[PDB]
Amino acid sequence: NLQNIIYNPVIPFVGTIPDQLDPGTLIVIRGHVPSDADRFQVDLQNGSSMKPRADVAFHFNPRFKRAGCIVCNTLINEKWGREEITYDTPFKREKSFEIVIMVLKDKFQVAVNGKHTLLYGHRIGPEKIDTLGIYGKVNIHSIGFSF
Numbered sequence: 383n384l385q386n387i388i389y390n391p392v393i394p395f396v397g398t399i400p401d402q403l404d405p406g407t408l409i410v411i412r413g414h415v416p417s418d419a420d421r422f423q424v425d426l427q428n429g430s431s432m433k434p435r436a437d438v439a440f441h442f443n444p445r446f447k448r449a450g451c452i453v454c455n456t457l458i459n460e461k462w463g464r465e466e467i468t469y470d471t472p473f474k475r476e477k478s479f480e481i482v483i484m485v486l487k488d489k490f491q492v493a494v495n496g497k498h499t500l501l502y503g504h505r506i507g508p509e510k511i512d513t514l515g516i517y518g519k520v521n522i523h524s525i526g527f528s529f
């Protein structure tokens with residue numbers, strides 16, 4: 383089932399994942415986007431080091447300017463890789479949401495509000511992920527894991 387690690391966390395939030403992200407693992411995040419929000423992101427990291435900055439296996443970056451979009455990338459040795467931009471974004475300012483990230487053998491599958499949103503192939507072994515961080519303009523109601 384689901385096991386939240388925090389409720390109404392102050393943002394930015396950086397927490398350690400209680401178990402290994404093996405295929406089949408679900409990460410659930412419920413929150414709300416403020417009316418003035420420009421962007422926010424959910425980063426799956428290897429450690430919480432800030433200098434040198436910890437590798438980010440999966441960077442999920444919803445942006446709200448223009449028509450909006452979702453930027454996904456990977457950070458290795460403080461170097462970003464090739465961006466994967468998703469334009470059919472379900473996120474909206476002043477609207478609550480529920481993000482579900484499925485960990486599959488070769489990629490992450492993200493659904494928002496019960497509807498598939500995007501996929502992202504692993505660039506870093508998922509077993510190296512033990513930290514989850516949330517930054518930017520967003521209100522988080524809960525972060526949980528279904529191992």
Ligand SMILES: [Cl-]
Pocket residue numbers: 486487488489
């Ligand atoms: Cl797969």
